[PDB]
Amino acid sequence: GGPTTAENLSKEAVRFYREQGYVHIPRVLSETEVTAFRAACEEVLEKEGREIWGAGEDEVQVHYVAQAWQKHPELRSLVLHPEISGIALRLAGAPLRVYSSDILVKEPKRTLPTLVHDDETGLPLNELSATLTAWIALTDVPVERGCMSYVPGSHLRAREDRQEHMTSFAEFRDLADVWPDYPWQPRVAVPVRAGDVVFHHCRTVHMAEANTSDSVRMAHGVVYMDADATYRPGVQDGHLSRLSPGDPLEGELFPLVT
Numbered sequence: 254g255g256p257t258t259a260e261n262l263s264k265e266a267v268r269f270y271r272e273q274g275y276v277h278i279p280r281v282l283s284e285t286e287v288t289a290f291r292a293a294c295e296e297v298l299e300k301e302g303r304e305i306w307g308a309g310e311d312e313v314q315v316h317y318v319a320q321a322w323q324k325h326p327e328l329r330s331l332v333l334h335p336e337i338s339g340i341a342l343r344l345a346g347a348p349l350r351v352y353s354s355d356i357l358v359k360e361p362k363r364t365l366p367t368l369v370h371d372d373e374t375g376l377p378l379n380e381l382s383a384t385l386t387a388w389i390a391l392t393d394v395p396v397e398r399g400c401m402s403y404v405p406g407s408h409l410r411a412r413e414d415r416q417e418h419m420t421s422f423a424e425f426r427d428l429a430d431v432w433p434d435y436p437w438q439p440r441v442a443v444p445v446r447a448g449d450v451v452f453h454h455c456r457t458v459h460m461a462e463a464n465t466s467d468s469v470r471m472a473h474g475v476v477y478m479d480a481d482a483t484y485r486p487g488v489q490d491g492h493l494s495r496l497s498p499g500d501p502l503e504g505e506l507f508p509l510v511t
């Protein structure tokens with residue numbers, strides 16, 4: 254029945270994360286915090302407008318707002334939430350910074366599944382080691398509301414079985430061509446309640462269901478990068494125009510997790 258905090262997080266949960274590449278941590282945010290953070294995200298959606306992850310209006314996987322935490326004063330306290338970010342730190346076992354966050358919405362009956370990938374491939378960064386994502390549920394997410402699934406142990410893939418980095422979208426390859434054994438790997442669906450968080454490593458292969466429920470799904474994805482991460486040109490780097498290749502990502506836009 255009780256909250257999970259950075260302090261009371263079990264050694265078993267940390268071991269599960271290190272071995273499996275993901276972990277479900279329940280009850281990190283209270284009902285009150287969920288309500289306040291969801292409302293702030295709704296304000297950002299209204300003010301910024303959403304973007305489509307997918308191939309146009311008829312092939313929406315996810316509606317999103319990128320660098321989302323920067324776009325509302327109250328969202329700083331989400332990405333640097335003491336429990337969420339403190340748990341991320343314990344799981345990673347190394348110093349972290351906030352890279353970015355996204356508002357991640359799936360509308361009911363109008364979404365495709367989120368196509369399988371690892372996050373490393375689309376991060377415009379060098380020097381990744383312990384980088385991981387906190388996928389924070391701001392609504393309940395039973396399976397059919399667009400829940401996440403993960404391939405256990407896939408973060409430990411050898412180099413030849415990983416794509417690593419896309420400089421441009423022409424480099425896209427089907428995961429089965431990159432990782433021939435992909436289709437014979439188990440796939441774990443992890444439904445969650447609002448306020449729960451699932452963390453996954455930047456090499457963990459993952460995906461999400463279509464939302465075929467009657468209710469909107471909203472999560473908030475926070476990418477916590479290695480604290481000494483540097484800039485590497487790639488797809489998804491439009492907001493990093495002020496940087497040169499190899500420059501460290503530091504300062505107020507990429508704050509240290511303490």
Ligand SMILES: O=C(O)CCC(=O)C(=O)O
Nearest residue numbers: 315357367386388461474
């Ligand atoms: O919310 C989704 O459907 C996709 C999430 C995702 O890929 C991530 O958090 O890395």
Ligand SMILES: [Fe+3]
Nearest residue numbers: 370371372459
């Ligand atoms: Fe992802």
